[PDB]
């Protein structure tokens, strides 16, 4: 069904929440009606991205300490790394409430050249010096910025209280910054030498340089990126009725379709002209449906209307008028069924809440639509995609009966694998649903009478008395129906005479 997967813990760069309860349109219409074409819009919220770069250094002491990251001064980035691709050995850091300087393997000051740190390109390149001791590291991490483009965060999860458009070169969002000017610099004419080959870039560029007390960052700078529409064309409905009741207009389409509700007041975004692109797309979609289905059936009247419907949906409506029976009950049945579905799903949302706390990996993956890593950071969930690995590069250990701790051995099989075919091999533990844990910690007081199975590739791997026996295909185990279609075989008794 799928290959193996390795899911490192998420760094919190991207956080996700639940859709929360939704208001169901309990009444299945039945009052006065009006016709018109419809197209709904919603918050575009497209976040800006830029493949920034992170620079920092590791510091340690040979005391049988207090290790933590350290930033890279701007002069060192443009002189040793940008020109020679080397890093300084000495680095100062607080040690037991007082500053102290480190060295490269307690030696004199020296320049250490940077080399790749991934061992095989499976993700971003990344570079390092060595696998008191000091190590210089550089990484081309990814970044995201919220819709207002006022703040951004890197892959490491540390928020940067500064807008990506910051810069004194021209008129930009230079007023948004919480850090002091001493922590920022904009290098002009930057030629961006690469650490993979040291071949220099193709043309000069202006690069912003900022550094928090934990590290140093940088990325190519441009004046501003205002090319973005506030709303996005979500759905285009061919037929949508406009009903009136309860002091709030109702916009409903086919029975199973979702019904919208508004305040009856025309929103001022279109008439203010700030949503020019929204009107253009809406008008194009409106004319598209009319010529596609109603040239001689209806007649367009007035101009498109806009409303900030419930739930944040921006509905664009265009009234229509007609130029000129068994469906009556069934429509009421289907409508009631749809409301039951909305109410039932609303209840199911509660069940999903405890499910995530119990198992965030499987729940987060199925909800988003793919194998993804996740852990609950309180009332909000963290998300980060997983890396895949082929079956050939994975092999289960012969036995989990770790002799180091008799009477208490691993409960799940220990697995050995390699990220890349030519890369080095690693050891870990086989989790649930082909999840290759990067660590081995599933200890259990192993006792007599053990006989279990574990998911492995397409089939299962048998085990008994904590020792590998053989594999077992999918069809080797009986299957039961954990469902109910729109329209059994179980037997055997226990050994009471044990």
């Amino acid at each position: 069904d799928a290959n193996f997967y390795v899911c490192p813990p998420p760094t919190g760069a991207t956080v996700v929440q639940f859709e929360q309860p939704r208001r169901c349109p309990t009444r299945p219409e039945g009052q006065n009606y009006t016709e018109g074409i419809a197209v709904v819009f919603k918050e575009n919220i497209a976040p800006y991205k830029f493949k920034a770069t992170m620079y920092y250094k590791d510091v340690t002491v040979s005391q049988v300490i207090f290790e933590d990251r350290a930033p890279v001064p701007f002069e060192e980035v443009i002189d040793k790394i940008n020109a020679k691709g080397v890093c300084r050995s000495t680095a100062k850091y607080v040690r037991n409430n007082l500053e102290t300087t480190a060295f490269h393997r307690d030696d004199h000051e020296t320049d250490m050249e940077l080399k790749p740190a991934n061992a095989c390109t499976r993700t971003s390149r990344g570079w390092h010096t060595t696998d008191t001791t000091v190590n210089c590291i550089v990484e081309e991490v990814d970044a995201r910025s919220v819709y207002p483009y006022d703040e951004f965060v890197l892959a490491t999860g540390d928020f940067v209280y500064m807008s990506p458009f910051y810069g004194y070169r021209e008129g930009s969002h230079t007023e948004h910054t919480s850090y002091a000017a001493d922590r920022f610099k904009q290098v002009d004419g930057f030629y961006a030498r690469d650490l993979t080959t040291k071949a220099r870039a193709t043309a000069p560029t202006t690069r912003n340089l900022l550094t928090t007390p934990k590290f140093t960052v940088a990325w190519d700078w441009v004046p501003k990126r205002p090319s973005v529409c506030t709303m996005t064309k979500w759905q285009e409905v061919d037929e949508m009725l406009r009903s009136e009741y309860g002091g709030s207009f109702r916009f409903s389409s086919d029975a199973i379709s979702t019904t919208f509700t508004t305040n009856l007041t025309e929103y001022p975004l279109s008439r203010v002209d700030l949503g020019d692109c929204i009107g253009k797309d809406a008008r194009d979609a409106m004319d598209r449906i009319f010529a596609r289905r109603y040239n001689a059936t209806h007649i367009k009247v007035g101009q498109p209307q806009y409303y900030l419907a419930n739930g944040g949906f921006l509905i664009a409506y265009q009234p229509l008028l007609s130029n000129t029976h068994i469906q009556r009950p069934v429509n009421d049945m289907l409508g009631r069924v749809a409301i039951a579905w909305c109410e039932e799903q609303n209840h199911e949302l509660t069940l999903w809440n405890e499910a995530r706390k119990l198992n965030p990996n499987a729940i987060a993956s199925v909800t988003v639509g793919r194998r993804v890593s996740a852990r609950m950071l309180g009332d909000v969930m963290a998300v980060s995609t997983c890396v895949p690995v082929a079956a050939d590069n994975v092999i289960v250990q012969n036995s989990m009966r770790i002799s180091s701790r008799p009477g208490a051995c691993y409960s799940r099989p220990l697995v050995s694998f390699r990220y890349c075919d030519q890369g080095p091999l690693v050891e870990g533990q086989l989790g649930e649903n082909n999840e290759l844990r990067l660590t081995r910690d599933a200890i259990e007081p192993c006792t007599v009478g053990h006989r279990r199975y574990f998911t492995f590739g397409g089939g299962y791997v048998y085990f008994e008395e904590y020792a590998y026996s053989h594999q077992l295909s999918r069809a080797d185990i009986t299957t039961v129906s954990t469902f109910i279609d729109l329209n059994h075989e179980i037997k055997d008794s226990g050994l009471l005479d044990y």
Epitope: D287, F290, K300, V301, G302, Q303, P319
Partner: antibody, heavy 120, light 107 residues
Framework: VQLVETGGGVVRPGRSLRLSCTTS????????MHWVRQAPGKGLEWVAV????????QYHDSVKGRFTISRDNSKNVLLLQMNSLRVDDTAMYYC?????????????????WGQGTMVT | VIWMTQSPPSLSASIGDTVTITCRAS??????IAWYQRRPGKAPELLVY???RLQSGVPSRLSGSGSGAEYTLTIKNMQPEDFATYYC?????????FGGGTKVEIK
Amino acid sequence: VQLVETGGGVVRPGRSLRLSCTTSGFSFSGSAMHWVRQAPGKGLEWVAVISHDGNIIQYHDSVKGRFTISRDNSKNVLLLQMNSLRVDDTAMYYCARDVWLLPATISYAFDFWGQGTMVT
Amino acid sequence: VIWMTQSPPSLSASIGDTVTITCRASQGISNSIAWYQRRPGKAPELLVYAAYRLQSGVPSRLSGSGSGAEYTLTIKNMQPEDFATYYCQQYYDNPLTFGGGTKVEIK
């Protein structure tokens, strides 16, 4: 159905003017209303629009701000006001009733007019 | 602003002829345009809405057509009351704008 405009007259540029249009013979409360301008011997050119309820108003770019439109169903009258008329503003004015299609819509057109009032 | 043109400004005809007028908008409104006519010494009166619908009083020999930005109004037969002026009015985008118009007179 008929409409009557009042308040016109020969006026030099550089001052304000107030005019209105009364309505009769139809459901003024349930219908929107228009205002049009026509220079001497030239074509027609729109001025403003007021819905049946009066919560939404639109104007022509050449008269936005300089002109205002207001209505009142209790006295079935359409009131308009403006300030500092220019020489090019010399034109014939009328109050036009919007084409009636549905109560919850504005046709952005018109089907009935009034006698009109001239301003120069 | 959306502009349009109407031609000819005036034409000479007689009872029993066939004539057609065209209104060409500056953009693809595709359906939002109306037509009007006016008798001398009298307020104008409407002809067509959305280029296809008619109203009360207009004879059956009146009918419009068009698409995109090209729109026309057809009069199948001339009568004594047809010697007047006609115009096109768009309502696709604000502000509303009128066309150049046309005129008709006896030969």
